[PDB]
Ligand binder design. Structure first.
Ligand SMILES: Cc1cc2nc3c(=O)[nH]c(=O)nc-3n(C[C@H](O)[C@H](O)[C@H](O)COP(=O)(O)OP(=O)(O)OC[C@H]3O[C@@H](n4cnc5c(N)ncnc54)[C@H](O)[C@@H]3O)c2cc1C
Ligand SMILES: Cc1cc2nc3c(=O)[nH]c(=O)nc-3n(C[C@H](O)[C@H](O)[C@H](O)COP(=O)(O)OP(=O)(O)OC[C@H]3O[C@@H](n4cnc5c(N)ncnc54)[C@H](O)[C@@H]3O)c2cc1C
Lengths: 577, 577, 104, 52
């Protein structure tokens, strides 16, 4: 606990870790604070799904997700309980109870929006989908030069993909994956392209995928250390970062005010460079607590002096979901190359195929797995191996289908009736819509109500914009219904539905990027530097100013890489002493 | 990783950690293996509830519990889903699907029984209640000398309480605690004693309790290290211990067969002393997989050669539960000492009390809290401060009320309608019955079906015995209904109910202790040494042979401490070269 | 708005209503027992196409009402059971029970 | 309610739902025996369960 660093980073999620990786590597003396604690094992900030227990029982992982997510704004509860005993203490009003937010209009919320406070942030639990944005979803980095803009994005995305270990081959020999992939490819031939969802993941064995995280980007070990004797990094968990201190001119940050949650002590930390990577909600909260924007209910009669676009133009994706149960036709197709003789459980039962036969609909690797499963498990009625990995299919956002898609499996809490259905049959469908940025859609903070860390209580004023956003969301629902029917019918209890607003956790635009503060209604420039401030940078999805359907983290990381490039050219590391 | 140690311990739960603490401390070269992995932060095997985020949001902790608990035996699912699309594939039978156990009679199960595979075992999520057993619940350690038996238990319990940091003071200044404690004390004046639940925990601040765990017993750091330079200890996570190898004479164990789940390598580990502390279920599995007892469906026409009582006489407690919403009478009594002038929210609202006065019903510390709450939070209709800790009350098992009681709060997933009720009002009631050991109540292992780690699948054959156990269980339900009514009426949605059998996770008797193998129908003696074997010891609740209602961990720990005494008297540590 | 789309089901010999020779119903009559599945082929394909059609057509009017999402109803809840004593021209050739005057 | 009150299910298969939270004192089945008007002839997977 020096009090002076070259760079201080608030937040140890994947974005904070991008800044760490770049700046620690470039020889800056870096400190990183997180309000949360170390709890991913020996690999700090690593993916919680990479334990043998969760690789064996993936659905239990829903619990890890739920256990770390804390709802951002919960309106006052007006449910009537009228079967209490007459002796029990009973309210005469729906008073402010149980951490509810009386500022929150229940009908203009993102009720699903939640935050994670743990070392590694949400990347300890995320699904690892890292697609690039096409031009239509993507903010500009170069004006009046589409080719230059493309090249820059390519360069940035490629590095970000390297940091995350993004690939598209980790499920290449899954039967379920290829069954779905091939069918959809055929069904949409000449109309849409399908591929594996790009995933931040490395396959380690047929039954183990090492999912990427913040740890993948930067290992979060203090430095100097044996492997990095000339680097300087300290991570300080359980430290609430409360305020960045503005100079009177509003041109520089002079310190970061922190609160050690274990000792209870408050301190001021000095750095040359201050980077806020606390998430799209908490970066906004930290800035508002530091005198940027406006505390309290927005009043257009009284616009704020600093960053008037902060907390406006917020975007969150519409999400539709269902599950399907694989069609009989597709299941039968799995064993199309098999010659089946005799009868199961008997000496006479024979399942064979001819490797390499040109009439085969499937490759040998597929037929071998099918044949062995069927020969070794004659009591089982399905041709899919027990350990066959899940599907990981997408058709990426295009103008004619302006939503992201994931046709896959992830952790899910199946009801007991749904557990009646063999897991091999089940596919999850998640289509993600883009949301137009609108000034009226706001994240603001109470001047009266405080959250669990005694900070101004976040409050949403949000509706999905009329027009394109709403039309496309409904069009997306329909496209899901149509596309999913090609694979199988809906699983009862997982019927097509919109998910609770914000449950997606793809919130953007809360501290949005643009070329010109006024003209582009924005808060940071393309170096992620806060307008007017020499030494204050914001990283994360809050930077993204566009309507996007694809998962935003890779894009946010790309912007952070670019930000680091500016930092490297404008600030000098202290000499290593 | 040598393959020769003085002592090898299977399992890193609190009972394995008792053996580690004692034997590492006595100078033995110790290896400990756990099939699970490190996932409590930098403190290896520590309580997962000891993060600032879970102390702020206790109810989220139910997710941690759920995430780690894996059902022991799930019967084949026969739920009819008859609203699938006609195109979806369906089986014609309720086939073995989804890890279900076809051996399992769904009507003679402990369906709620589950196991945890993580470093620190279940002690990374337990409730920390550590009562002693009275004589009626307690196995004898001394024959025909009640006062000597008492003395021995007292010595061992006192040490166990020290290892766990058990205390009865961590909630002493909770308003809610004292409200409930005082009321029940008065209601049962001269009939029952109430006190704080003895809890393995240390309060660190008014809003933080450091709950104990395996880490508390033994920090699980490899030794030698700077703080323990003469000690020798290695922990090897993600290692499945599969079997112990018996000599032909069945007088000694010769090695421990392990499978490293990360590398995939298998080793035979040699030690002088083999200690199995894998839990009541997995100790049993390991022993059966090693040729103790009998594999397969019990057949009494072919009793097994070794440990014929292994996996018989199993006990699990009956558990009844409800929640209550505090009576109006009790809530009003909180503010009994207050003089209230004016209307709240208005100008000259005043709430006052006289410090140290004799007609005061409450202590100054209480009235000061109440006053400051009522005054600083005039919008709130309750007199209980917002950060008041929860109740932690018990009346311990006695012959006239032969159940354990906990009248308290722990993590709970409230429905949205239940979240309508102010949490300060709610109290959980859990009463725990004792179950008679009966030979017919069995844990056995399939000779064909295997579990997720390719080990013989555990199967229960369990019913609560008729007679005393069942009568007491029903009497206990009535008692809860009677007693809870003194505090408030039932909370809707948490009405009085029996919990699913085994959800309690207090299974005992699977490898039970006694003086004489045949006469006492048992597997280990009072040193926890397996009959016939010089150098094999079992630790845990599986040792407890009695019908007990109180939480068993402290009792198992006490047994382990006695076991370690035997080891120190019979095995010499290797010289530390 | 409620949306109910009804498919047609191919008549198949294997789909039967039969009556127990042991179990009786509430009026002491032979207990009815079904042996029924929706036929593979046209019936099943059309059923799924029908679901999709409902999804597509309904979206023109509004989104789904939560709790009344697109679903197949329990088989027979419709109560449009047919063919148990079916009509045709020739008893044998048309596998039937009554002629076109509904005469047995 | 009128519709439900009049409709009587044609064939209800034997119920195999497990209730394992009965009190230990309550009488409990060792099998899923023919109970409550159910039809043991009926394959639950080849029914028109909604027929009434
Ligand atoms: C279940 C799940 C599935 C997801 N799936 C995907 C996916 O497939 N693809 C994808 O692109 N994204 C997905 N996401 C989103 C993704 O995880 C986030 O976009 C990403 O983690 C954001 O990174 P970040 O570093 O900006 O913020 P975060 O990961 O939120 O990290 C921010 C951090 O700052 C901390 N912090 C907050 N406030 C303070 C404060 N005042 N002081 C100090 N520290 C503070 C936190 O404790 C935290 O660790 C998913 C998220 C979840 C939870
Ligand atoms: C939610 C919860 C609440 C509880 N509340 C209480 C309470 O208040 N008081 C109380 O007394 N008890 C309580 N318990 C029970 C208590 O946690 C257990 O009694 C105690 O942890 C048992 O300790 P143990 O060391 O014998 O076994 P465990 O804690 O089960 O540890 C055994 C270990 O062995 C490992 N293992 C298993 N198989 C193998 C193998 N083949 N090879 C290598 N390792 C293996 C595991 O991975 C594990 O870590 C609670 C438990 C739960 C989960």
């Amino acid at each position: 606990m020096d009090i002076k660093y070259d760079v201080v980073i608030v937040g140890s999620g994947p974005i904070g870790c991008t800044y760490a990786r770049e700046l620690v590597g470039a020889g800056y003396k870096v400190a990183m604070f997180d309000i949360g604690e170390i709890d991913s094992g020996l690999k700090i900030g690593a993916h919680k799904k990479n334990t043998v227990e969760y690789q064996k029982n993936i659905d239990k992982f829903v619990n890890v997700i739920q256990g770390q997510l804390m709802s951002v704004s919960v309106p006052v509860n007006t449910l009537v309980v009228d079967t209490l005993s007459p002796t029990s203490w009973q309210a005469s009003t729906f008073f402010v109870r149980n951490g509810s937010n009386p500022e929150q209009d229940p009908l203009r919320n993102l009720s699903g929006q939640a935050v994670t406070r743990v070392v590694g942030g949400m990347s300890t639990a995320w699904t690892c989908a890292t697609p690039r944005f096409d031009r239509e979803q993507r903010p500009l980095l170069v004006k009046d030069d589409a080719d230059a803009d493309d090249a820059e994005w390519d360069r940035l995305y490629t590095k970000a993909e390297s940091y995350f270990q993004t690939g598209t081959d980790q499920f290449k020999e899954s039967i379920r994956h290829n069954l779905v992939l091939n069918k959809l490819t055929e069904e949409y031939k000449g109309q849409r392209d399908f591929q594996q969802i790009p995933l931040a993941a490395t396959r380690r064995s047929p039954t183990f995928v090492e999912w990427s995280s913040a740890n993948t980007v930067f290992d979060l070990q203090n430095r100097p250390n044996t492997d990095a004797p000339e680097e300087r990094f300290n991570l300080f968990p359980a430290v609430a970062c409360e305020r960045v201190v503005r100079n009177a001119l509003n041109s520089e940050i002079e310190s970061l005010h922190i609160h050690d949650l274990i000792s209870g002590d408050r301190f001021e930390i000095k750095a040359d460079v201050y980077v806020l990577t606390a998430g799209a909600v908490h970066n906004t909260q930290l800035l508002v607590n530091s005198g940027f924007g406006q505390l309290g209910r927005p009043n257009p009669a009284n616009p704020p002096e600093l960053l008037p676009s902060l907390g406006s133009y917020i975007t969150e994706q519409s999400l539709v979901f269902c599950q399907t149960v694989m069609s009989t036709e597709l299941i039968d197709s799995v064993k199309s190359d098999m010659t089946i003789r005799g009868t199961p459980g008997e000496l006479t039962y024979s399942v064979t195929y001819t490797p390499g036969a040109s009439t085969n609909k499937h490759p040998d690797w597929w037929n071998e797995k099918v044949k062995n499963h069927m020969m070794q498990h004659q009591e089982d009625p399905l041709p899919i191996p027990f350990e066959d990995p899940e599907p990981q299919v997408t058709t990426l956002f295009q103008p004619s289908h302006p939503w992201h898609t994931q046709i896959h499996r992830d952790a899910f809490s199946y009801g007991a009736v749904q557990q009646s259905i063999d897991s091999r049959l089940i596919v999850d469908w998640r289509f993600f819509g883009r949301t137009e940025p609108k000034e009226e859609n706001k994240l603001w903070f109470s001047d009266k109500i405080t959250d669990a860390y005694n900070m101004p209580q976040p409050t949403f004023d949000f509706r999905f914009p009329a027009g394109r956003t709403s039309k496309e969301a409904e069009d997306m629902m329909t496209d899901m219904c149509v596309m999913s029917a090609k694979i199988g019918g809906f699983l009862p209890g997982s019927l097509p539905q919109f998910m609770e607003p914000g449950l997606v956790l793809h919130l953007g635009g809360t501290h949005r990027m643009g070329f010109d503060e006024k003209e582009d209604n924005c808060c940071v420039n393309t170096d992620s530097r806060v307008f007017g401030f020499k030494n204050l940078f914001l990283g994360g999805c809050g930077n993204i100013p566009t309507a996007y359907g694809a998962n935003p983290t890779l894009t946010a990381m790309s912007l952070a890489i670019k930000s680091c490039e500016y930092i490297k050219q404008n600030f000098t590391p202290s000499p290593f002493t």
